[PDB]
Design goal:
This is part of a larger assembly, with ten protein chains of ten kinds.
Chain C (H helix, E strand, L loop, with lengths): L5 H24 L12 H13 L16
Chain D lengths: L2 H20 L3 H15 L9 H30 L12 H15 L8 H6 L3 H22 L5 H17 L7 H18 L5 H23 L6 H10 L2 H14 L8 H11 L5 H12 L2 H12 L8 H4 L12 H8 L13
Chain H lengths: L1 H22 L7 H19 L2 H4 L5 H24 L6
Helix pairs in contact in H: 2-4
Classes of the chains: A mainly alpha, B mainly alpha, C mainly alpha, D mainly alpha, E mainly alpha, F mainly alpha, G mainly alpha, H mainly alpha, I mainly alpha, J mainly alpha.
Catalytic activity (chain D): a ubiquinone + NADH + 5 H(+)(in) = a ubiquinol + NAD(+) + 4 H(+)(out)
Pfam family, one (chain D): NADH_dehy_S2_C
EC number (chain D): 7.1.1.2
């Protein structure tokens, strides 16, 4: 009967955050702090309409917010953020109690400097 | 239609004909009843898994435990018949004629 | 004395010492110094799938950190 | 046997049947049928003769395969539109398997081969309780799931069960086989009007249960297996004879007596449809299954067979059986004729 | 590399079992006043090599069978259980991380019951059938107990992954919050391995022998993971593997050491003792280990 | 008394009775239920913003919403 | 007969094992949640006969959500057509991973 | 199929051990039955018990405690019934 | 973020797969190019043969059956 | 070793049901039901199957066939194949071969249905955030919502115990 109304390939081109998983998992909480304020727009769109192919502008918005956040954490302290997530990477499933002292180090970096 | 359901229904008919036609021992009949039980278990479990019928997913294990204690009662009845007779054939039961 | 039984128990304990240590060495070798990612939940498996998708090598151990941001 | 254990087993029969009555989930109905089987097995083999053992074996095999075919029908129901609500089904095939399962559960013509064999080698109490609760338990389920049944199923099983309980029945003097063939004929009657007005089915269920309770209570008052023992009961006591007369004639269904009232209302709310030849066929077979009742009455209370002494000895002992409740059930079962508009007490 | 992992698991099992034979003979010899086997080379490792290859050399039992296929089909099942039962056992990194492994343990124990029953039926005339029937009874009467106790000791940890067990053993040993439950579990392991002080008084005798001793080492490794042990700092698995091997070896020596000095029980005493003393006590420990985590505000982080 | 007769049964009844009773006198069961309730499985779903309600806080740093503080402090 | 002590005592002890979309212990849906909600709201205050003859469209939508029969029929027709045209040889296929 | 690979390797190596070991050198009682059915029924009640450590994280804890104690209590009543009523005697 | 990438990827497979279908089925009579079989105007969740259809085995086996027997 | 492994294990499953529905000696029947239960465990674990298919394995292949083989050992003898048994096995293999041949080289096979004939990688999850293996939390109900169900189940098993002892000479 009725045909679907798919979006085009012009909206299906956002600069995708092609980052890996352990760095994204370790960089979650402060990403919840600074960013993730305008993506509850996306969450409320997803739970008031059960229809992606519609809420994709806010998906592009959370994509650019996460990329902007990782740009901002890339430019400033820390570069031992790399040491922190590679300390937490090879520990099986990533328990956050594993590398706790360097978690304190990254917190002290980002707190005293940003 | 999730094609495997056809094979498990045909397997149910296999176990049901094995339950109905049975030559000598009652134990084969009771074990094919158990096979029919397993068929219903597997068929309903694949249905509930693919449905994501996650609230009432109790059907496989509870169907299992009930018809298992049915099979326990059948074992006790077969032991009683084999105790008051020599064997447990379908024959040597032709007394009490209808 | 029991100095003459400790070689037997010693060699049998070495026979029990070997397989987990060699297995953990093969775990660390088959992912380039990484640990093999355990998988118990759909969340961890989907995170692993997007990790092996974004890596480019279709391999989840390369772990591609901070050098594809801009 | 302990009396505590028998009270427990009666509690579990009542629990299983009430679970069948009260639940709305399919698993719970299947649990109720199975628990009814598991509890009713040690009421049989109450003695330790091998007759009751073989009877319980046959009963267990047929009852368990009926239970599992019922579970097959339910899992077909959820292979189609799937929810655990006792309602209209969603497959003619599932309804076919389910009504054939319940036809195995309660006494039907292709499936009646276990009923006289299970009733012959058991005592009277086990036969009474199995007839009452094992003909009460599926009727609630059929009353529930009537609006999605192909009618030819129910009507074919009803017609053939009435004529089999008729024709098979002219040959046995084993009183348990007589009562079993009567059960087959009346269950055909009580299943026939399921798709037209089930008030008649449940009223016929009430009347049949009270009648069979009266009949088996009269047999428990003086232990008999044959008609010649009933002639000895004629010699020893006269009031049992007129009770056998009235209760056999109310199993026969004559219009002065209360057993006619379930036939007549069936014929009424059957012939308000376009079914006339089917009522006259069913009521001709209802004339047929009165003949073994009538030769039984001729054997008991109207002609008289020669008697044996030591009835002279049994004269010196007055009767000392306890009846559970015989006279209340008797005059409830036989003088109920002017209370036909207690039809509408039911729905 | 995965078949290399499997072969590095199931190649040292023959070494482990044969050296366990020499170790049990030497340890019984020194619980007794006997030295040896030490004439066959230095302290006799070539002595298990020699008697293993001797029993391979020696001419088999002539049939005398019923369904030759069934008669070969029972010990092949016993030895493939003994091989396929070291897959989810964690010394630090197990071969297969599972959602649940302990129910797999109990299920393969029941398959060992199948092995005993099939060898008993396919063996011989009626007296060995009665003996193996009593053996199946006294084996099956304990899988109630061991599964009950294993359930009550994992209930402190909530999950079945068993790497959560090696996490939750970090602070104290699990022998301290459940000593009597662990003690009864150890008695049930003596029951499942079917040794003294429990009675059992074939072909191939070497294969049934192999299944026996791999079952023993299996239960010892599962004990050492289950109730005691120590921590595991990552990127150094040799430390935990050393401590695990030393504790499992001490426990297996204690196992044969308990075997060494007790007479076999009467059979009706065995059933009587199991039912009327372990079964109410297991129920008591289960209901207290149910009602206690809801008391002490400690229900486990079952993720 | 029966402590000499069937002692393991009496010990089983004793630990059974204390397992029955002991959750009644318990200062930790409300702690257990708060711990068990305060762990979310699904997504904490947002809502359409406000009818100018002094609840449902906008920043996740804002402590106007109901949070947990007895977790960190044992 | 069917009795109603289930409704009479006010203990709804058996209505939760019954359908989907009753509240799961963690608030997750099934695979065909919304189809059920609209179908139940279609046939609620209904005497189960105009449920048969009026809510047919949404019931067929729910059934084809639950089993996905004819959608698999369409996909299977696409597969058989793809097989016979790759057997023919026209456009050695760029529907896999590349042009 | 990875554990199926392990099962296949163990099964094939076991068959190699057996076949190379073989090509090279060339009435009853009711008391037997009661213990097995007692095993069967208590094992099914174990099957009802054993998802208890799955369940202990919910928002209904007192009810879980009550019905878990009811399950072990029913199992204990069955045990004590066959204990007192000469079910396992000799 | 994972949700947004997932939505863009499934709509990407929808767009490319209906482009493939529109290229491939121009011989059969009938056949509207992109009809849902359903009637309501709602985005149904696809069935893993609308997403991973005609991908020839490898990716669909590593995608559907991946977690089911991955360790 | 390929995609239709669920279908192939189903073929071995129905072969096992035929293999003991041909009525052998009941210890061969117990063997056939053990093999059938193992491959049914394989099928349901292929659907995953994380708990329930390993759960059946302890009950039927852990507690039921043990007592079935036990009662085969203690009650019936069957002391010595036949035409009828192996002939029914041949006809069952013929019926399965015919049905699966018509599934393979045609569209669909209909008893009275429309079984859409291809192997089932469809349908399946589209990689959702499961995080608890939904079987696990489902069966981790029955103690919050499950008031009536576990009560009547345990009560039925208790009545099963008293029934078994009564028939086997209560008290």
């Amino acid at each position: 009967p009725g045909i679907v109304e798919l979006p085009s390939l012009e909206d299906l081109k956002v600069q995708e955050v092609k980052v890996s998983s352990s760095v994204l998992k370790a960089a979650a909480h402060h990403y919840g702090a600074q960013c993730d304020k305008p993506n509850k727009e996306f969450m409320l769109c997803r739970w008031e309409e059960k229809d992606p192919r519609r809420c994709l502008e806010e998906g592009k918005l959370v994509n650019q917010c996460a990329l902007e956040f990782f740009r901002q954490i890339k430019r400033h302290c820390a570069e031992p953020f790399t040491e922190y997530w590679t300390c937490i990477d090879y520990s099986g499933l990533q328990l956050f109690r594993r590398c706790r002292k360097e978690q304190a180090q990254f917190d002290k970096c980002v707190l005293d400097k940003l | 239609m999730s094609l495997v359901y056809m094979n498990i229904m045909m397997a149910f008919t296999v176990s049901l004909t094995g339950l109905l036609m049975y030559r000598s021992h009652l134990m084969s009949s009771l074990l094919c009843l158990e096979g029919m039980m397993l068929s219903l278990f597997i068929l309903a479990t694949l249905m509930i898994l693919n449905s994501h019928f996650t609230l009432a997913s109790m059907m496989p294990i509870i169907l299992l435990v009930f018809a298992a204690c049915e099979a326990a009662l059948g074992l006790s009845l077969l032991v009683m018949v084999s105790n008051t007779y020599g064997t447990d054939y379908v024959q040597n039961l032709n007394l009490l004629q209808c | 004395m029991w100095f003459e039984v400790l070689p037997g128990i010693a060699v049998m304990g070495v026979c029990l010492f070997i397989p987990g240590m060699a297995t953990a060495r093969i775990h660390r070798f088959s992912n380039g110094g990484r640990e093999k990612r355990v998988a118990h939940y759909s969340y961890q498996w989907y995170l692993m799938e997007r990790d092996r998708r974004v890596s480019g090598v279709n391999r989840y151990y390369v772990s591609k950190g901070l050098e594809n941001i801009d | 046997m302990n009396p505590i254990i028998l009270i427990i087993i009666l509690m579990t029969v009542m629990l299983g049947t009430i679970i069948v009555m009260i639940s709305t989930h399919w698993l719970l109905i299947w649990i109720g049928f199975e628990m009814n089987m598991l509890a009713i097995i040690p009421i049989m083999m109450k003695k330790h003769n091998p007759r009751a053992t073989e009877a319980s074996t046959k009963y267990f095999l047929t009852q368990s395969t009926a239970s599992m075919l019922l579970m097959m029908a339910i899992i077909i129901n959820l292979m189609f539109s799937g929810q655990w609500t006792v309602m209209k089904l969603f497959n003619p095939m599932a309804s076919m398997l389910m009504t054939m399962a319940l036809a195995m559960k309660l006494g039907m013509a292709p499936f009646h081969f276990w009923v006289p064999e299970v009733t012959q080698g058991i005592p009277l109490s086990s036969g009474l309780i199995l007839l009452t609760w094992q003909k009460l338990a599926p009727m609630s389920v059929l009353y529930q799931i009537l609006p999605s049944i192909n009618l030819d199923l129910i009507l074919t099983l009803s017609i053939l069960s009435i004529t089999i309980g008729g024709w098979g029945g002219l040959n046995q003097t084993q009183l348990r086989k007589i009562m079993a063939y009567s059960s087959i004929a009346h269950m055909g009657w009580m299943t026939a009007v399921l798709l037209y007005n089930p008030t008649m089915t449940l009223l016929n269920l009430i009347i049949y249960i009270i009648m069979t309770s009266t009949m088996f209570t009269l047999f428990m008052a003086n232990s008999t297996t044959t008609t010649l023992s009933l002639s000895h009961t004629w010699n020893k006591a006269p009031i049992m004879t007129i009770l056998v007369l009235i209760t056999l004639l109310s199993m026969g269904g004559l219009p002065p007596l209360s057993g006619f009232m379930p036939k007549w209302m069936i014929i009424q709310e059957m012939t308000k449809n376009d079914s006339i030849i089917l009522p006259t066929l069913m009521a001709i077979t209802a004339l047929l299954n009165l003949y073994f009742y009538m030769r039984l009455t001729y054997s008991t209370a109207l002609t008289m067979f020669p008697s044996t002494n030591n009835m002279k000895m049994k004269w010196q002992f007055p009767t000392t059986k306890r009846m559970t409740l015989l006279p209340t059930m008797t005059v409830l079962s036989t003088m109920l004729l002017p209370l036909t508009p207690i039809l509408s007490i039911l729905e | 590399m995965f078949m290399i992992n499997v072969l590095t698991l199931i190649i040292p099992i023959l070494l482990a079992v044969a050296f366990l034979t020499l170790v049990e003979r030497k340890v019984l010899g020194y619980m007794q006043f006997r030295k040896g086997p030490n004439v066959v080379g230095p302290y006799g490792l070539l002595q298990p090599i020699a008697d293993a290859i001797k029993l391979f050399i020696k001419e088999p039992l002539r049939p005398a069978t019923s369904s030759i296929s069934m008669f070969i089909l029972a010990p092949i099942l016993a030895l493939t259980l003994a091989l396929t039962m070291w897959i989810p056992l964690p010394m630090p990194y197990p071969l297969i991380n599972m959602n649940l492994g302990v129910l797999f343990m109990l299920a393969m124990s029941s398959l060992a019951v199948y092995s005993i029953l099939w060898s008993g039926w396919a063996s011989n005339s009626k007296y060995a059938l009665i003996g193996a029937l009593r053996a199946v009874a006294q084996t099956i009467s304990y899988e109630v107990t061991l599964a009950i106790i294993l359930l009550s000791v994992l209930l402190m940890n909530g999950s079945f992954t068993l790497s959560t067990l090696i996490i939750t053993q970090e602070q104290v040993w699990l022998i301290f919050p459940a000593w009597p439950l662990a003690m009864m579990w150890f008695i049930s392991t003596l029951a499942e391995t079917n040794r003294a002080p429990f009675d059992l008084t074939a072909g191939p005798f070497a294969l049934f022998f192999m299944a026996e001793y791999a079952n023993i080492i299996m239960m010892n490794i599962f004990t050492t993971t289950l109730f005691l042990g120590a921590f595991h700092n990552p990127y150094m698995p040799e430390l935990y593997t050393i401590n695990f091997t030393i504790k499992s070896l001490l426990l297996s020596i204690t196992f044969l050491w308990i075997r060494a000095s007790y007479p076999r029980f009467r059979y009706d005493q065995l059933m009587h003792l199991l039912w009327k003393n372990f079964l109410p006590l297991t129920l008591a420990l289960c209901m207290w280990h149910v009602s206690l985590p809801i008391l002490l505000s400690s229900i486990p982080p079952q993720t | 008394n029966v402590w000499a007769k069937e002692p393991v049964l009496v010990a089983s009844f004793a630990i059974a009775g204390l397992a029955v009773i002991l959750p009644t006198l318990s200062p930790y069961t409300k702690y257990s239920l708060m711990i068990n309730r305060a762990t979310p499985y699904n997504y904490p779903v947002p809502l359409r913003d406000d009818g100018n309600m002094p609840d449902v806080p906008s920043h996740p740093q804002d402590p106007q919403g109901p949070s947990l503080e007895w977790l960190k402090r044992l | 007969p069917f009795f109603d002590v289930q409704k009479k005592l006010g203990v709804d002890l058996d209505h939760w094992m019954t359908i989907q979309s009753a509240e799961q212990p963690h608030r997750i849906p099934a695979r065909c949640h919304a189809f059920e909600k609209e179908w139940i709201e279609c046939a609620h205050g209904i005497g189960s006969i105009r449920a048969e003859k009026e809510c047919k469209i949404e019931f067929e939508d729910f059934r084809e959500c639950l089993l996905r029969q004819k959608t698999m029929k369409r996909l299977n027709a696409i597969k058989r057509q793809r097989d016979k045209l790759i057997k023919e040889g026209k456009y050695t296929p760029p529907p896999h991973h590349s042009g | 199929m990875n554990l199926m690979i392990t099962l296949l390797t163990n099964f094939t190596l076991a068959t190699l051990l057996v076949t190379i070991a073989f090509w090279l050198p060339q009435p009853f009682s009711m008391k037997f039955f009661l213990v097995a059915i007692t095993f069967l029924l208590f094992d099914l009640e174990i099957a009802l018990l054993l998802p208890l450590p799955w369940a202990s994280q919910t928002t209904n804890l007192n009810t879980m405690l009550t019905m878990a104690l009811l399950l072990i209590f029913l199992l204990a009543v069955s045990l004590a019934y066959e204990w007192t009523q000469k079910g396992l005697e000799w | 973020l994972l949700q947004a990438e997932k939505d863009r990827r499934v709509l990407q497979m929808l767009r490319e797969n209906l482009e493939e279908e529109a290229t491939i089925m121009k011989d059969v009579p009938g056949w509207k190019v992109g009809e849902s079989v359903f009637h309501t105007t709602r985005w149904v969740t696809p069935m893993m043969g609308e997403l991973y259809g005609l991908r020839t085995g490898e990716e669909i086996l590593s995608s559907t059956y991946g977690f089911i027997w991955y360790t | 070793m390929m995609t239709y492994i669920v279908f192939i294990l189903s073929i071995i499953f129905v072969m096992g049901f035929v293999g003991f529905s041909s009525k052998p000696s009941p210890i061969y029947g117990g063997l056939g039901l053990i093999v059938s239960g193992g491959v049914g465990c394989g099928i349901v674990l292929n659907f995953g199957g994380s708990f329930l298919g390993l759960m059946v394995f302890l009950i039927y292949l852990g507690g039921m066939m043990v007592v079935f083989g036990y009662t085969t050992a203690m009650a019936t003898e069957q002391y010595p194949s036949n035409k009828v048994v192996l002939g029914t096995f041949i006809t069952g293999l013929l019926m399965e071969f015919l049905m699966v041949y018509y599934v393979l080289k045609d569209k669909e096979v209909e008893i009275v249905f429309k079984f859409n004939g291809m192997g089932d990688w469809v349908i399946y999850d589209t990689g959702d955030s499961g995080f608890f293996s939904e079987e696990a939390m489902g069966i981790a109900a029955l103690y919050s919502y499950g008031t009536w169900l576990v009560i009547v189940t345990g009560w039925s098993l208790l009545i099963g115990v008293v029934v078994i002892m009564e028939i086997t000479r209560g008290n």
